[PDB]
Amino acid sequence: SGQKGKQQTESKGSFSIQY
């Protein structure tokens, strides 16, 4: 839950939740 990283449309971006 919370704010994730940069969720791209083309890719999933990176597995990291931003805090």
Name residue, tokens 């931003």.
18
**In sequence order, which residues have a C-beta less than 8 Å from that of residue 12 and are 6 or more positions away?**
none
Task: Name the residue among 6, 9, 5, 8 with its Cα closest to residue 17.
Answer: 5
- Other C-beta atoms closer than 10 Å to the C-beta of 10 total 5
CB 10 within 8 A of CB 3: no
Tell me the sheet residues that pair with 4. 17
The technique is: NMR
Cα separation of 11 and 1, whole Å?
20
Please provide residue 4's backbone torsions phi and psi, each rounded to the nearest 5 degrees: -85, -175
CB 14 within 8 A of CB 5: yes
CA distances from 17 to 4, 12 (A): 4, 12
Cα separation of 12 and 14, whole Å?
6
